[PDB]
Amino acid sequence: KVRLVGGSGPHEGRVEILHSGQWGTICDDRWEVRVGQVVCRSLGYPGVQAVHKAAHFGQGTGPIWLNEVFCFGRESSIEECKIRQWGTRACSHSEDAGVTCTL
Numbered sequence: 001k002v003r004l005v006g007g008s009g010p011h012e013g014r015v016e017i018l019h020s021g022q023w024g025t026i027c028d029d030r031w032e033v034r035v036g037q038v039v040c041r042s043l044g045y046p047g048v049q050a051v052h053k054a055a056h057f058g059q060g061t062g063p064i065w066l067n068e069v070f071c072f073g074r075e076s077s078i079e080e081c082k083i084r085q086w087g088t089r090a091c092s093h094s095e096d097a098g099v100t101c102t103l
């Protein structure tokens, strides 16, 4: 699953993802509008207004599940994008990625 946390409404926040039985976050190293678009679609929003780096909505906790993700932009969910490994060592939660969706 996917949820947004820390925003002014459910349309934005730190991106969190459920994997290996655990809610985790996304590192901002390769975070950009194409994958923001996919995250926003999978949440039922029609588009992405902005992507935010550097724990813009505050740091998450626990596993950092994704770092090097590639989406074309049209995928239904982030699990459908190109993911070479789940779970990353390269990152701190000060890098947790965030998104602001169109509603």
Ligand SMILES: [Ca+2]
Pocket: 027, 028, 029, 095
């Ligand atoms: Ca970074």
